[PDB]
Design a protein around this motif. Structure first.
Motif, PDB file in Angstrom:
ATOM      1  N   UNK A  38      27.465 120.142 111.673  1.00  0.00           N
ATOM      2  CA  UNK A  38      26.389 120.090 110.621  1.00  0.00           C
ATOM      3  C   UNK A  38      25.261 119.096 110.964  1.00  0.00           C
ATOM      4  N   UNK A  39      24.013 119.533 110.911  1.00  0.00           N
ATOM      5  CA  UNK A  39      22.915 118.640 111.219  1.00  0.00           C
ATOM      6  C   UNK A  39      22.055 118.391 109.994  1.00  0.00           C
ATOM      7  N   UNK A  40      21.249 117.327 110.100  1.00  0.00           N
ATOM      8  CA  UNK A  40      20.352 116.883 109.043  1.00  0.00           C
ATOM      9  C   UNK A  40      18.898 116.860 109.536  1.00  0.00           C
ATOM     10  N   UNK A  41      17.977 117.116 108.611  1.00  0.00           N
ATOM     11  CA  UNK A  41      16.548 116.905 108.850  1.00  0.00           C
ATOM     12  C   UNK A  41      16.004 116.021 107.728  1.00  0.00           C
ATOM     13  N   UNK A  42      15.972 114.700 107.870  1.00  0.00           N
ATOM     14  CA  UNK A  42      15.347 113.875 106.815  1.00  0.00           C
ATOM     15  C   UNK A  42      13.835 114.049 106.753  1.00  0.00           C
ATOM     16  N   UNK A  43      13.280 113.704 105.564  1.00  0.00           N
ATOM     17  CA  UNK A  43      11.841 113.628 105.261  1.00  0.00           C
ATOM     18  C   UNK A  43      11.516 112.171 104.910  1.00  0.00           C
ATOM     19  N   UNK A  88      12.948 125.717  98.050  1.00  0.00           N
ATOM     20  CA  UNK A  88      12.967 124.832  96.888  1.00  0.00           C
ATOM     21  C   UNK A  88      11.561 124.365  96.530  1.00  0.00           C
ATOM     22  N   UNK A  89      11.323 124.120  95.243  1.00  0.00           N
ATOM     23  CA  UNK A  89      10.063 123.532  94.813  1.00  0.00           C
ATOM     24  C   UNK A  89      10.237 122.025  94.741  1.00  0.00           C
ATOM     25  N   UNK A  90       9.277 121.295  95.287  1.00  0.00           N
ATOM     26  CA  UNK A  90       9.331 119.836  95.348  1.00  0.00           C
ATOM     27  C   UNK A  90       8.025 119.276  94.789  1.00  0.00           C
ATOM     28  N   UNK A  91       8.134 118.303  93.878  1.00  0.00           N
ATOM     29  CA  UNK A  91       6.990 117.869  93.068  1.00  0.00           C
ATOM     30  C   UNK A  91       6.283 116.666  93.685  1.00  0.00           C
ATOM     31  N   UNK A  92       4.985 116.539  93.395  1.00  0.00           N
ATOM     32  CA  UNK A  92       4.193 115.440  93.940  1.00  0.00           C
ATOM     33  C   UNK A  92       4.912 114.108  93.780  1.00  0.00           C
ATOM     34  N   UNK A  93       5.153 113.431  94.906  1.00  0.00           N
ATOM     35  CA  UNK A  93       5.876 112.150  94.940  1.00  0.00           C
ATOM     36  C   UNK A  93       7.182 112.176  94.136  1.00  0.00           C
ATOM     37  N   UNK A  94       7.871 113.257  94.226  1.00  0.00           N
ATOM     38  CA  UNK A  94       9.262 113.267  93.837  1.00  0.00           C
ATOM     39  C   UNK A  94      10.080 112.669  94.978  1.00  0.00           C
ATOM     40  N   UNK A  95      11.159 111.932  94.682  1.00  0.00           N
ATOM     41  CA  UNK A  95      12.004 111.393  95.763  1.00  0.00           C
ATOM     42  C   UNK A  95      12.854 112.459  96.447  1.00  0.00           C
ATOM     43  N   UNK A  96      12.354 112.997  97.561  1.00  0.00           N
ATOM     44  CA  UNK A  96      13.015 114.020  98.357  1.00  0.00           C
ATOM     45  C   UNK A  96      13.119 113.468  99.765  1.00  0.00           C
ATOM     46  N   UNK A  97      14.325 113.451 100.335  1.00  0.00           N
ATOM     47  CA  UNK A  97      14.434 112.896 101.681  1.00  0.00           C
ATOM     48  C   UNK A  97      15.150 113.801 102.672  1.00  0.00           C
ATOM     49  N   UNK A  98      15.269 115.089 102.394  1.00  0.00           N
ATOM     50  CA  UNK A  98      15.526 116.005 103.478  1.00  0.00           C
ATOM     51  C   UNK A  98      16.609 117.029 103.164  1.00  0.00           C
ATOM     52  N   UNK A 114      12.765 111.730 116.679  1.00  0.00           N
ATOM     53  CA  UNK A 114      13.167 110.333 116.832  1.00  0.00           C
ATOM     54  C   UNK A 114      14.018 110.233 118.087  1.00  0.00           C
ATOM     55  N   UNK A 115      13.564 109.458 119.070  1.00  0.00           N
ATOM     56  CA  UNK A 115      14.349 109.306 120.292  1.00  0.00           C
ATOM     57  C   UNK A 115      15.459 108.253 120.174  1.00  0.00           C
ATOM     58  N   UNK A 116      15.399 107.383 119.160  1.00  0.00           N
ATOM     59  CA  UNK A 116      16.346 106.279 118.974  1.00  0.00           C
ATOM     60  C   UNK A 116      17.521 106.794 118.155  1.00  0.00           C
ATOM     61  N   UNK A 117      18.584 107.176 118.852  1.00  0.00           N
ATOM     62  CA  UNK A 117      19.795 107.641 118.212  1.00  0.00           C
ATOM     63  C   UNK A 117      20.253 106.782 117.053  1.00  0.00           C
ATOM     64  N   UNK A 118      20.564 105.505 117.300  1.00  0.00           N
ATOM     65  CA  UNK A 118      21.089 104.663 116.229  1.00  0.00           C
ATOM     66  C   UNK A 118      20.129 104.641 115.051  1.00  0.00           C
ATOM     67  N   UNK A 119      18.846 104.369 115.310  1.00  0.00           N
ATOM     68  CA  UNK A 119      17.879 104.272 114.219  1.00  0.00           C
ATOM     69  C   UNK A 119      17.881 105.520 113.354  1.00  0.00           C
ATOM     70  N   UNK A 120      18.224 106.674 113.945  1.00  0.00           N
ATOM     71  CA  UNK A 120      18.154 107.961 113.255  1.00  0.00           C
ATOM     72  C   UNK A 120      19.397 108.217 112.407  1.00  0.00           C
ATOM     73  N   UNK A 121      20.589 108.061 112.996  1.00  0.00           N
ATOM     74  CA  UNK A 121      21.819 108.092 112.207  1.00  0.00           C
ATOM     75  C   UNK A 121      21.783 107.065 111.082  1.00  0.00           C
ATOM     76  N   UNK A 122      21.094 105.939 111.311  1.00  0.00           N
ATOM     77  CA  UNK A 122      20.905 104.895 110.304  1.00  0.00           C
ATOM     78  C   UNK A 122      20.080 105.395 109.117  1.00  0.00           C
ATOM     79  N   UNK A 123      18.941 106.032 109.388  1.00  0.00           N
ATOM     80  CA  UNK A 123      18.138 106.587 108.304  1.00  0.00           C
ATOM     81  C   UNK A 123      18.906 107.700 107.595  1.00  0.00           C
ATOM     82  N   UNK A 124      19.502 108.623 108.362  1.00  0.00           N
ATOM     83  CA  UNK A 124      20.228 109.746 107.766  1.00  0.00           C
ATOM     84  C   UNK A 124      21.379 109.261 106.894  1.00  0.00           C
ATOM     85  N   UNK A 125      22.221 108.377 107.443  1.00  0.00           N
ATOM     86  CA  UNK A 125      23.369 107.871 106.699  1.00  0.00           C
ATOM     87  C   UNK A 125      22.949 107.279 105.360  1.00  0.00           C
ATOM     88  N   UNK A 126      21.883 106.474 105.352  1.00  0.00           N
ATOM     89  CA  UNK A 126      21.473 105.782 104.134  1.00  0.00           C
ATOM     90  C   UNK A 126      20.914 106.748 103.097  1.00  0.00           C
TER      91      UNK A 126
END
Lengths: 237, 300
Positions: B1-6, B22-32, B83-95
């Motif tokens: 399973x893969x992720x695409x954060x926003x 999906x419909x996503x609203x102006x500055x609604x908190x959506x992260x991927x 994102x070429x930085x593996x750790x930095x990316x799993x870090x954003x996704x995980x959080x």
């Protein structure tokens, strides 16, 4: 695009162009067999290819042999016409090759287009006009040379005889189509009109009689009158 | 399973992911989008609430890198980036999952639809049609033209589809004019399959990619290309039997997936009646013929 009454006079400018009429390419008789089914017997045909500016006619005779052992003949006729038109173009020196070829029937666009792929700069065009070139086999000398042929043959004529020596292409072409229109609607009467007077003859190298200017006027009027009579008869008007 | 954060969603937009959206609203908190199945290509696509024109999106394959989405206010559109930085990316996704701000790729387990639409599509082939080789993903939008359309203007933004032309020297062998134009088997089998595509699966992949671009972005040149490829097969009297059976499944799922209301611009009346009812292959698309009759009888 398509040729219609609007762009009629393009035909007589100095860009070379040909008409191609394919209505006499595949000609059959219909008869009953001994068991009583219906069968076709083909006869000699012709491709009618015409430069309306100069009168030069390229009459490509189509010998019945061509059809031997073939299916979907009416469809093949369209493809043989394009094969033969293509070969004519290719036989002609560059400066004599047409810039446009106008087919009198839209079914010939795709076969010609394909056969002319080697000439991307020659435009293949339909027409909306209702031209009477089908009646070409009502001109005695053309039907004679079609019906007598024993092999494929090309015969050149000038369908204007020597008219251009005294009239313009526009006028010559209008005269040709008026005469063909008359022939098509009532051949017996059209031929009566042209030939009643035995003292006006057809030169050996000509298709039509040697009318004087004044006599062509009587003739064109008689052809007109014929055509309007037959119209009223067709529609009870 | 893969992720695409926003990074963020500053402007109101309808987001698509493959056949979902999906419909996503102006500055609604959506992260991927999470739980995306590895092993197929995907496409994430967009339509701004303000400009119902211009649908646009990115084709991608998760095996080829870590990709995310960020809105660009100079250019005014959501951009795919790597994102070429593996750790930095799993870090954003995980959080972001921890904060649960991610929608789940909503696959029903019975559903093979997306697989059936993309069976033959390979990311390496997409990147030859959408040439931009500093990026591992591929951008497409509604207005992009094909190469064949450019012939009849900026080639950087061209869909470099394989050019098919029934009235061309390529398609027609001299001396076999009539034969080759009524029976295109030569063109399909030697010129196209053996010559250019090398095998049926590349052919089908381009066909399938072309259909999705038409369906997802109303890309007019892509519809044209899809129909050309269909026409070429149906107008060939001699087609490998496995190709005929695969084409019937391919088309079936494409017709099945098409929005009902778009049938008028997306389906070329002439090609389909020819394929289904006139061509050599009229009797060989039984599934496609049945779905078309029961869903769009009027078009025929």
């Amino acid at each position: 695009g398509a040729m219609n009454s609007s762009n009629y006079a393009e035909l007589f400018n100095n860009d070379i162009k040909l008409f191609v009429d394919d209505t006499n390419v595949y000609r059959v008789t219909v008869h009953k067999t001994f068991e009583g089914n219906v069968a076709t017997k083909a006869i000699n045909g012709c491709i009618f290819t015409l430069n309306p500016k100069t009168g030069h006619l390229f009459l490509k005779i189509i010998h019945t042999s061509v059809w031997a052992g073939q299916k979907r003949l009416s469809q093949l006729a369209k493809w043989k016409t394009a094969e033969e038109v293509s070969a004519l173009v290719r036989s002609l020196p560059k400066e004599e090759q047409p810039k446009q070829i106008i087919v009198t029937r839209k079914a010939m666009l795709d076969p010609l287009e394909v056969h002319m792929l080697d000439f991307p700069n020659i435009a293949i065009r339909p027409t909306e006009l209702r031209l009477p070139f089908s009646a070409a086999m009502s001109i005695d000398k053309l039907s004679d040379v079609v019906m007598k042929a024993t092999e494929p043959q090309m015969v050149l004529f000038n369908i204007y005889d020597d008219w251009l020596d005294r009239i313009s292409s526009y006028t010559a072409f209008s005269r040709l189509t008026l005469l063909l229109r008359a022939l098509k609607t009532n051949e017996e009467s059209a031929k009566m009109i042209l030939l009643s007077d035995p003292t006006i003859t057809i030169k050996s190298y000509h298709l039509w009689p040697s009318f004087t200017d004044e006599q062509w006027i009587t003739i064109e009027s008689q052809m007109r009158d014929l055509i309007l009579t037959e119209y009223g008869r067709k529609y009870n008007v | 399973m893969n992720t695409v954060p926003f990074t963020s969603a500053p402007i109101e937009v309808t987001i698509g992911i493959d056949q979902y959206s999906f419909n996503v609203k102006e500055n609604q908190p959506f992260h991927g989008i999470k739980d995306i199945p590895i092993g197929h290509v995907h496409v994430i696509h967009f339509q701004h609430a303000d400009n119902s024109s211009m649908r646009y999106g990115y084709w991608f394959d998760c095996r080829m890198g870590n990709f995310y989405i960020q809105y660009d206010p100079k250019d005014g559109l959501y951009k795919m980036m790597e994102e070429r930085d593996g750790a930095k990316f799993e870090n954003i996704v995980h959080n972001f999952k921890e904060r649960q701000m991610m929608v789940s790729y909503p696959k029903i387990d019975e559903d093979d639809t997306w697989y059936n639409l993309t069976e033959f599509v390979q990311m390496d082939k997409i990147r030859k049609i959408v040439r931009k080789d500093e990026n591992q993903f591929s951008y497409v939008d509604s207005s992009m033209t094909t190469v064949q359309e450019n012939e009849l203007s900026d080639p950087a933004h061209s869909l470099n589809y394989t050019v098919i032309n029934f009235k061309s020297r390529e398609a027609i062998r001299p001396g076999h004019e009539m034969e080759d134009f009524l029976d295109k088997s030569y063109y399909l089998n030697t010129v196209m399959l053996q010559g250019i595509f090398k095998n049926s699966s590349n052919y089908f992949g381009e066909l399938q990619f072309a259909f999705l671009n038409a369906m997802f972005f109303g890309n007019y040149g892509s519809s044209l290309q899809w129909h050309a490829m269909i026409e070429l097969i149906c107008s060939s009297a001699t087609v490998p039997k496995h190709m005929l059976d695969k084409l019937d499944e391919i088309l079936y799922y494409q017709i099945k997936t098409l929005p009902e209301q778009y049938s008028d611009i997306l389906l070329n009346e002439r090609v389909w009646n020819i394929c289904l009812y006139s061509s050599f292959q009229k009797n060989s698309l039984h599934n496609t013929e049945k779905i078309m009759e029961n869903k769009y009888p009027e078009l025929l």
